[PDB]
C-alpha cells in the first residue's frame, strides 16, 4: 500500500531532518503519518506527545522547538484543530519558531458543501506560514518507486528548510499536507538528509562610529556581536549577552545617548520605545530576517553586522556605569524598604536563585519585565519567552515542552527548567498540566507562580491612575480567587504555597519532576513601589 | 497643502531616493495625487514617466523597464479592476524575481462594503504572489503629526523597496503598495514637502545583502552544467560542458548544445538558476539516478529534479574534469551544431527556426535581445546562439503570452537609459525582439505609446509570422488567424515592413529608426519534418 | 473511465440548470469536462466560445450571462488563467453575475514547491466568490454508480444555486473544481428537471413610507420594480428598470428640495445624487435585494426590500418636479445645438434617439453611461447593460459581444424575423482597452446584429469635468488625465477584419437604422477640449 510506504518515507526524512518530537491529539480521523509515527516512537527514533487540549498542544510544540532549537511537528486530526492551533501558529510566525503543521486532506471526498471533520479552514494560514506544501496522493506504480521516493524526500526537505530557515534565515510555521485516500525505500547513505543545505550567511555591514555616545538595545532574537561587547547594553532577558557592560533599563531616561544600536526586536520598557522614536537620535537596526522592527519609522539604517570605527568616550562610558549602579541601588533599596511581597520581589528571588546551565521560562506581562528590573545576569543561562505576540496563553505547556526538549538534549550527552509566570497566565493554560501516565513528563521542571490575584501590570498604566480606582479593579484587575493548590492536586501535581524567603532554599533542593511553587503577592502597592523606585532615581 | 498631496509627494520623493528611475502610470481620478506628484518629478527630470492606457500590458512594460537595467520600477493606477489587471504581470514578476512595485490608489478602507463606486478588496488581492502587501494609513488632517507621519510614510516606502529588490532576502519580486486616498485629491492653489534625509539618502538605508552558501563539488566526476533563468556567474565552472538557456549568463566558453545532452551520460549535474526550457533537460533531471547540485543566487531552488543532493550559491571545487570527458562533450556539441545547420540548409521553406537563426547571426556585442517566451527562445537555443556580450531578456517566470511587446519596449527604454547615464557619444545600443505572430497580435496594443510618451530610440521587433503556430479549445488553430500585421502596426502608428529572411540581416543594420516592426513570413507546415530531420541527423 | 462518466453527469446537470454558454481558452493542460462539453457542443445542447485572451474571455462570459440572465461557465486551463480572470470575477461579484469558474486540480501531483500550470493562485477567490466546491476524484465503483450520480448532481446543483442566488437572492461567481488524474451516462431526474429543485424564493422586508412627504426615487444598478412607487419623480440610472412613467432628469435634482428619498438598488452616478443621499436632514430609505445595502455616508435611515405606502405625492410637488424636469431637458437640448463641436454628449443624444423597443443597449463606463442619462434616454422596452459592479473600462467590448450573442440566442429559441439589435456606446479609451475582443475565429459564434458605437475624443473626456479639469492644471493634466493616443480605429478594425465606418453625428441615426454585417464598429470623432465649458453652459441655462 503506497500510503503506508509514503508515510514511512516522510517520517524517516523528518527524523533525518532533526525532528525529535511530534505532538498529536485524538480526533475524528486518524493522524497523518499515524502508524509510521507509532513505529518510529516505539523504536525510539522519535518521541510522541499526546494531548486532549488542541490549543495547549500547539504551545507544547512551541516549547519542544525552542527547548533545543529543533523543528517540531504537530498533527491535525479534527474539525477544531485549525482554530485551536491558531494562537500557537501565530506565535511561531512572529517568534520565528520551526513548527511543522501536519494535515491530511481527502481528495476523493467533496469540499465546500458542508462542515468537514478533519479540516475547518480559517484565514490565518495564508498570512502566518513560511510555506504550504501538499505531497500529492500516493499511487500504485512499483516501477516508479525510486522516483516517488526522491519526490517525497525532496518535498519533505523543502518543508524542513522552510521551517528551520535553512536558506532564508527566517524560521517559522509550515503547513504540510499528506493527502489520504482510505521494506522502506532508503534515503541517503549514513542518515544524511535527501537534499542537504550547507550553512548560510546573510551579510549586511553597517558603518558605525562608536566614538559617538552609543547605547545598545537588544530584544528577542538578537544576535551576538563581539565588536560591541564594550558598549553599555540594555538587554531584554531573552537576548543573548555580547559582553560585560550592562545598563539597567531605568537608567536610560537618566542618560542622553546620541545614537542607538538596536539588536533584534525590543518589546519592553517605555523609555526604550521613547528613545527609538527620538528623531534626533540615529538608530541602527542589526537583525536577522526579512523585516526589521521600527514602530516610529525613525531608523536610519538596517543590517546584520557593524563595521565599527573609533571607541566609546571614557566620559560617556563612566556616566553610563554611574547611572547603572544608581538604578540597581534604587531597585534593591525600595524592595527592602517594602513590607508587602509583590511580583517584583518574587522576580528578584527567582533571579538570584538561578545557576549556570539553567533554563528560565518567563511569562508575559510583569514577570518578563520584573526580571529585567531585578537585574538578572543572563550569561550562562538560557531564557525563553513567547515574545512573538506576547500572549498570556499557552505558557504552561511551553515551559513543559521546553523542559522536555532541554532535558532530552542532555540525556543525549538533568538541568533545571524554572518558569516564572503570573496567576492569570497560569489559569489560562492550567490544562497543560494534564498529562497522562503514558506521556513524556519533565524530570526537572519547577513552575513559580507569582499570584497577586489579577493583572498587576495594569496598575502601572494610565488605567492604574487613582482616578480610575472604583472602575479599574473589575475590568483591568480581574480578580479570580482561584485555589491554586487545589487545582494542581486536581491534576496530581506537587504544589507548595510559600513566602519569598523560602523561594531560594526551596528551588535549591529537587523534588518531583513537575512541581508548582506558589508565592502570594500584592498588586495594590505596585504603582507606589515603582513610583518610589524612580523617586530614588 | 492638503494631506493627499503631501502624502503623495513624500512617497514619490522617497521612491526616487530608493533608486526608482522609471514609473508607469495609468489614468484615473482616485490616483490623482500620485499622478500629479509623478508628473512633477518627471518635469524636474528626477524620473521618467510612462503613461499607458491598459493596466495589464502596462505591468509588463514595467517588467521590461526593470529587467533592462536591473532597477526597481513602479506602476501606478486607480482603484478597482485597474489593480486586478496587474495580476498577470505580478505572477510573472514573482517567478522571474522582478522588482515590480504595484502602487495602487484606493478609496479609504472604511468605504469597503458600503456600495461605494469602484471599490473592491484591494489589500491582499495578490495573495502569496507578492513579497509583501503594505498599506499606508489614510493621511490625517493634523499639522502637529506632520513630522511623525513623514517618518512613517518614508519608512514604509523603504520597506516596500527593500522587499521588492530583495535587499534583505536576496529574493527580489513584486510588492503591493496600496495607498488609501480621500478628497481633496488635487493640489491646493499655492503661492512645502516635509524633507527626507540630508544628501538625498533613503530614509532607512538598507544595503544589498550578500547571500552566501558554499558547496563542495568534485569536478573529476563527469559533469555537465545546466544553467537556466536567473543563473549566477561561476568562473570556477567555466571550463565544464554547459547547456545554457539564452537568458542565462555564460560563465565561460565550453558550450554544449541541448540536443547533444541526451546522447551523453554525465555522472553528475550542476544546475544553475531555474532551467525550464528544454525537454531533454527535463528528461535528464527527471531520472533520479544522476546526482544534481543546485546553485542559485537566492534562497529559492528549483523542484525540477527530485535528486538534488544539495543547494548552494557557489561551488568549492576539488579535482578537474577528465580530458576524455571534455573531448567527448565537445565532439558531440559540434555534431549537434552541424546537424542543425545542415538540415536547415536542406530545407527550402522558411520556418521560424530559419528566422531565429537569421536573427542570431545578425547580433553583435552590446545588443539587447528580447525573446518571446514560447517558440523564439527555443528556436534561438536550437540555432545555437552564442550569448556572450549580449543581454538576453525573456519572461521565463511563467512564460505567458501576455505583455511581450510592452516588455520589449520597456527593456529597450531602460537599456537605452543606462547608456545615457554614462556620457558616451555613441548611438544608443540596439534592442532586437523576436516574437511569434500570435504573441504579437495578442499584445499588439502594447505598441500603443501616446504622442507625449517616451519612445525607444533603437528597437526593432522581428515578427516570425507562420500565421498561428487533442483538445476542443485547439480548434481556433484549425485555420490561420489571418490578422493583418501591417494594419495592426498602422493603427498604433508604428513603422512596419514585411520582408524576406535573406533581407533580415541587412535591414537590421540599417540605422535605428526609433521603433519598428519587421514582419517575416514563415511556414509551419514543414516544421514537424524539419525537427524530425534534425533528430535523425544525430 | 470514471472521470469521463463524471464529466458527462456534471455537464448534463449544468445544462439542466440553465447553462447555454461555456467559455474556454487553450491552455497547457486539458480543460475541465473538456470532452463532455465538446460532445454537448456538437449535439447542440450547449454552445462553446473559444478565445486566446483569457481576460477578454472572462468578460465575454459576463456578457453571455447578463444578456439573458443565464448562468455561464468559464474554464481555467493555464498558469495565467486566475490572474487574467480576476477583473471579470470581481465585476461578477459586485454586479451579481452568475459566473461559474471551472477548474481541475491534480491530487496526484505535488503542490506549493514551485510553478503551477493548472492554477497559480492569487488572493481574490477568498473574497469574491459565493462558494468554492470541489467534486472529489471519480472512483471506479460500478456498485456505487447511482450513489455517485446522486452526489455529483447534488453538488452541481449547489454550484448553480450559489451562482444564480436561487436561495440567497445573491447571484455571483462560484469556484467549481473537478479534480483529475492524468491522462453511457447515468440519468438525471425525469422530464429534464434539475436533481435538486429550488422553487421560487422571496426575501420580504417591508418598510412604512408616507408618500405625502415630498419624495424622490433614485434607482441604480440592480434596482427592483415597484408598482406602488410608479407615480413618484424618479431619477433612474440607465441600467435600472423603470417602475413608472414620471422621470426626473438628473440635472433637475439639485433644483429641488426633496424631504424624502427612496433609493432603489445601487446608485453610482451623478454628484447631486451622492450629495442628496448624504444629506443628514433627508430620510433615505434603501430598497434593494441582497445581503448588503448601499450607504457611503451612513446617513440612511432604514433598509428593506419593498415599501408599504400611505398617502400620495402632493400635486404641487409633482408640478414642481415636472417644471424643473422641463428646464433640464431644454437646457441640454439648447446647449447641444448652440455648441458646434461634436462631443460624447452629442453622440449619446444621437444613439438615444435611434433606439427602438426590443433593442439591447450596452454602455461603457466613464462619460457614455452618464451622457445617456443626461440625454434623457427613455429606457422602457429597452434592455440596458453596463458593468457598474466596479465600473471598469476593461473588457467592455467582449461584454457587448457576449451580451449580443446571449440576447440573440434567446430570440432564436422563440422561433419568431431578424434578431433584435444590440447597440453598444463606449469611449475610445474603453475601446482600446479591449480591442482584442474583436478577434473571433471563424470556428466561434459571432453576433448577427451587434453595432459598437465608439465616441472617440482621443482620451478620457470625463476628467475634463472633474477638479483636475480646472484650467489651472491645463499645463500638466494632458499627459496624466487626458492620455491622448492617436489610434487609427479604422485600421484596427481592418486588422481584425471587422466592418467599420467613421461617420459624423448627423449620420449616426440613419446609419444605425440600416443593418450591416453581424458585427460592425461605428466611429464618431469627438472633442473634449470644449467639454467643461459645455457642461458649465448647460448648468447656467437650467
Ligand atoms: C506593556 C504595556 O502595554 C501592554 C500591557 C498589557 C497587555 C498585555 O498584552 C501585556 C503583554 C506583554 O507585552 O507582556 C497583557 S498583560 C495581561 C495580564 C497578565 O496578568 P498575570 O497575572 O498573568 O501577570 P501579572 O499579574 O501582570 O504579573 C493581560 C491580560 N494582557 C492582555 C492579554 C490578553 N489575552 C491574551 C491571550 N494575552 C494577553 N497578553 C497589552 C494589551 O492588552 O494591549 C498592552 O499592550 C505598556 O504600555 O507599557
Ligand atoms: C465620476 C467621478 O470620478 C470618476 C472619474 C473617472 C474614473 C473612472 O473609473 C470612471 C468610471 C465610472 O465611474 O464610470 C474611469 S473613466 C476613465 C477614462 C475613460 O475614457 P473613455 O475614452 O473610455 O471615455 P470618455 O472619454 O470619458 O467618454 C478611466 C481611465 N477611469 C479609470 C479606470 C482605469 N482603469 C480601468 C480598468 N477602469 C477604470 N474605470 C474614476 C476613478 O478613476 O476614480 C472616478 O471615480 C466623480 O468624481 O464624479
Ligand atoms: Mg497577576
Ligand atoms: Mg506562430
Ligand atoms: Mg474618450
PDB file of N, CA and C in Angstrom, chain A residues 281-322:
ATOM      1  N   UNK A 281      17.991  61.144  17.563  1.00  0.00           N
ATOM      2  CA  UNK A 281      18.887  60.037  17.870  1.00  0.00           C
ATOM      3  C   UNK A 281      18.889  58.993  16.754  1.00  0.00           C
ATOM      4  N   UNK A 282      19.971  58.955  15.960  1.00  0.00           N
ATOM      5  CA  UNK A 282      20.133  57.955  14.898  1.00  0.00           C
ATOM      6  C   UNK A 282      20.049  56.529  15.432  1.00  0.00           C
ATOM      7  N   UNK A 283      19.206  55.712  14.809  1.00  0.00           N
ATOM      8  CA  UNK A 283      19.034  54.323  15.217  1.00  0.00           C
ATOM      9  C   UNK A 283      19.474  53.369  14.111  1.00  0.00           C
ATOM     10  N   UNK A 284      20.361  52.442  14.462  1.00  0.00           N
ATOM     11  CA  UNK A 284      20.829  51.415  13.540  1.00  0.00           C
ATOM     12  C   UNK A 284      20.299  50.049  13.964  1.00  0.00           C
ATOM     13  N   UNK A 285      19.544  49.403  13.081  1.00  0.00           N
ATOM     14  CA  UNK A 285      18.940  48.109  13.389  1.00  0.00           C
ATOM     15  C   UNK A 285      19.764  46.951  12.839  1.00  0.00           C
ATOM     16  N   UNK A 286      20.282  46.117  13.733  1.00  0.00           N
ATOM     17  CA  UNK A 286      21.032  44.936  13.325  1.00  0.00           C
ATOM     18  C   UNK A 286      20.260  43.677  13.701  1.00  0.00           C
ATOM     19  N   UNK A 287      19.632  43.052  12.707  1.00  0.00           N
ATOM     20  CA  UNK A 287      18.792  41.880  12.936  1.00  0.00           C
ATOM     21  C   UNK A 287      18.985  40.825  11.854  1.00  0.00           C
ATOM     22  N   UNK A 288      18.567  39.602  12.160  1.00  0.00           N
ATOM     23  CA  UNK A 288      18.475  38.547  11.160  1.00  0.00           C
ATOM     24  C   UNK A 288      17.026  38.428  10.702  1.00  0.00           C
ATOM     25  N   UNK A 289      16.823  38.241   9.402  1.00  0.00           N
ATOM     26  CA  UNK A 289      15.483  38.073   8.874  1.00  0.00           C
ATOM     27  C   UNK A 289      15.117  39.079   7.801  1.00  0.00           C
ATOM     28  N   UNK A 290      13.980  38.845   7.129  1.00  0.00           N
ATOM     29  CA  UNK A 290      13.488  39.659   6.012  1.00  0.00           C
ATOM     30  C   UNK A 290      13.043  41.061   6.416  1.00  0.00           C
ATOM     31  N   UNK A 291      12.526  41.212   7.631  1.00  0.00           N
ATOM     32  CA  UNK A 291      11.995  42.501   8.063  1.00  0.00           C
ATOM     33  C   UNK A 291      12.690  43.019   9.319  1.00  0.00           C
ATOM     34  N   UNK A 292      12.512  44.307   9.594  1.00  0.00           N
ATOM     35  CA  UNK A 292      13.146  44.938  10.744  1.00  0.00           C
ATOM     36  C   UNK A 292      12.123  45.674  11.600  1.00  0.00           C
ATOM     37  N   UNK A 293      12.384  45.774  12.913  1.00  0.00           N
ATOM     38  CA  UNK A 293      11.465  46.490  13.801  1.00  0.00           C
ATOM     39  C   UNK A 293      11.684  48.000  13.760  1.00  0.00           C
ATOM     40  N   UNK A 294      10.601  48.756  13.602  1.00  0.00           N
ATOM     41  CA  UNK A 294      10.645  50.214  13.656  1.00  0.00           C
ATOM     42  C   UNK A 294       9.232  50.786  13.705  1.00  0.00           C
ATOM     43  N   UNK A 295       8.692  50.900  14.914  1.00  0.00           N
ATOM     44  CA  UNK A 295       7.332  51.390  15.116  1.00  0.00           C
ATOM     45  C   UNK A 295       7.173  52.847  14.678  1.00  0.00           C
ATOM     46  N   UNK A 296       8.155  53.679  15.013  1.00  0.00           N
ATOM     47  CA  UNK A 296       8.071  55.112  14.739  1.00  0.00           C
ATOM     48  C   UNK A 296       8.469  55.468  13.309  1.00  0.00           C
ATOM     49  N   UNK A 297       9.242  54.596  12.671  1.00  0.00           N
ATOM     50  CA  UNK A 297       9.744  54.863  11.336  1.00  0.00           C
ATOM     51  C   UNK A 297      10.992  55.725  11.375  1.00  0.00           C
ATOM     52  N   UNK A 298      11.707  55.663  12.494  1.00  0.00           N
ATOM     53  CA  UNK A 298      12.818  56.569  12.755  1.00  0.00           C
ATOM     54  C   UNK A 298      14.187  56.012  12.372  1.00  0.00           C
ATOM     55  N   UNK A 299      14.274  54.690  12.229  1.00  0.00           N
ATOM     56  CA  UNK A 299      15.531  54.002  11.920  1.00  0.00           C
ATOM     57  C   UNK A 299      16.297  54.630  10.763  1.00  0.00           C
ATOM     58  N   UNK A 300      17.587  54.864  10.980  1.00  0.00           N
ATOM     59  CA  UNK A 300      18.439  55.453   9.957  1.00  0.00           C
ATOM     60  C   UNK A 300      18.928  54.390   8.977  1.00  0.00           C
ATOM     61  N   UNK A 301      19.155  53.183   9.488  1.00  0.00           N
ATOM     62  CA  UNK A 301      19.699  52.101   8.675  1.00  0.00           C
ATOM     63  C   UNK A 301      19.460  50.728   9.301  1.00  0.00           C
ATOM     64  N   UNK A 302      19.386  49.704   8.452  1.00  0.00           N
ATOM     65  CA  UNK A 302      19.241  48.319   8.906  1.00  0.00           C
ATOM     66  C   UNK A 302      20.290  47.407   8.270  1.00  0.00           C
ATOM     67  N   UNK A 303      20.680  46.364   8.995  1.00  0.00           N
ATOM     68  CA  UNK A 303      21.668  45.419   8.509  1.00  0.00           C
ATOM     69  C   UNK A 303      21.802  44.225   9.432  1.00  0.00           C
ATOM     70  N   UNK A 304      22.932  43.532   9.347  1.00  0.00           N
ATOM     71  CA  UNK A 304      23.172  42.356  10.177  1.00  0.00           C
ATOM     72  C   UNK A 304      24.444  42.505  11.007  1.00  0.00           C
ATOM     73  N   UNK A 305      25.378  43.311  10.508  1.00  0.00           N
ATOM     74  CA  UNK A 305      26.680  43.492  11.147  1.00  0.00           C
ATOM     75  C   UNK A 305      27.062  44.960  11.262  1.00  0.00           C
ATOM     76  N   UNK A 306      27.969  45.254  12.188  1.00  0.00           N
ATOM     77  CA  UNK A 306      28.520  46.595  12.314  1.00  0.00           C
ATOM     78  C   UNK A 306      29.994  46.614  11.920  1.00  0.00           C
ATOM     79  N   UNK A 307      30.381  47.616  11.137  1.00  0.00           N
ATOM     80  CA  UNK A 307      31.791  47.873  10.864  1.00  0.00           C
ATOM     81  C   UNK A 307      32.207  49.100  11.667  1.00  0.00           C
ATOM     82  N   UNK A 308      32.717  48.857  12.870  1.00  0.00           N
ATOM     83  CA  UNK A 308      32.961  49.925  13.832  1.00  0.00           C
ATOM     84  C   UNK A 308      34.286  50.648  13.626  1.00  0.00           C
ATOM     85  N   UNK A 309      34.241  51.970  13.749  1.00  0.00           N
ATOM     86  CA  UNK A 309      35.443  52.785  13.865  1.00  0.00           C
ATOM     87  C   UNK A 309      35.345  53.594  15.151  1.00  0.00           C
ATOM     88  N   UNK A 310      36.490  53.913  15.747  1.00  0.00           N
ATOM     89  CA  UNK A 310      36.514  54.667  16.986  1.00  0.00           C
ATOM     90  C   UNK A 310      36.153  53.821  18.194  1.00  0.00           C
ATOM     91  N   UNK A 311      36.022  54.475  19.344  1.00  0.00           N
ATOM     92  CA  UNK A 311      35.701  53.791  20.593  1.00  0.00           C
ATOM     93  C   UNK A 311      34.879  54.713  21.491  1.00  0.00           C
ATOM     94  N   UNK A 312      34.043  54.136  22.371  1.00  0.00           N
ATOM     95  CA  UNK A 312      33.208  54.970  23.242  1.00  0.00           C
ATOM     96  C   UNK A 312      34.030  55.872  24.164  1.00  0.00           C
ATOM     97  N   UNK A 313      33.662  57.148  24.224  1.00  0.00           N
ATOM     98  CA  UNK A 313      34.328  58.111  25.094  1.00  0.00           C
ATOM     99  C   UNK A 313      34.295  57.637  26.543  1.00  0.00           C
ATOM    100  N   UNK A 314      35.431  57.757  27.247  1.00  0.00           N
ATOM    101  CA  UNK A 314      35.526  57.345  28.653  1.00  0.00           C
ATOM    102  C   UNK A 314      34.591  58.150  29.549  1.00  0.00           C
ATOM    103  N   UNK A 315      34.319  59.393  29.163  1.00  0.00           N
ATOM    104  CA  UNK A 315      33.344  60.219  29.865  1.00  0.00           C
ATOM    105  C   UNK A 315      31.951  59.610  29.731  1.00  0.00           C
ATOM    106  N   UNK A 316      31.591  59.250  28.502  1.00  0.00           N
ATOM    107  CA  UNK A 316      30.313  58.605  28.222  1.00  0.00           C
ATOM    108  C   UNK A 316      30.210  57.251  28.919  1.00  0.00           C
ATOM    109  N   UNK A 317      31.270  56.455  28.813  1.00  0.00           N
ATOM    110  CA  UNK A 317      31.316  55.139  29.442  1.00  0.00           C
ATOM    111  C   UNK A 317      31.111  55.213  30.954  1.00  0.00           C
ATOM    112  N   UNK A 318      31.725  56.208  31.586  1.00  0.00           N
ATOM    113  CA  UNK A 318      31.665  56.338  33.037  1.00  0.00           C
ATOM    114  C   UNK A 318      30.314  56.870  33.506  1.00  0.00           C
ATOM    115  N   UNK A 319      29.718  57.752  32.711  1.00  0.00           N
ATOM    116  CA  UNK A 319      28.401  58.291  33.028  1.00  0.00           C
ATOM    117  C   UNK A 319      27.352  57.180  33.034  1.00  0.00           C
ATOM    118  N   UNK A 320      27.467  56.262  32.077  1.00  0.00           N
ATOM    119  CA  UNK A 320      26.532  55.147  31.955  1.00  0.00           C
ATOM    120  C   UNK A 320      26.643  54.188  33.132  1.00  0.00           C
ATOM    121  N   UNK A 321      27.875  53.873  33.517  1.00  0.00           N
ATOM    122  CA  UNK A 321      28.119  52.971  34.634  1.00  0.00           C
ATOM    123  C   UNK A 321      27.599  53.563  35.942  1.00  0.00           C
ATOM    124  N   UNK A 322      27.696  54.884  36.068  1.00  0.00           N
ATOM    125  CA  UNK A 322      27.229  55.577  37.264  1.00  0.00           C
ATOM    126  C   UNK A 322      25.712  55.489  37.393  1.00  0.00           C
TER     127      UNK A 322
END
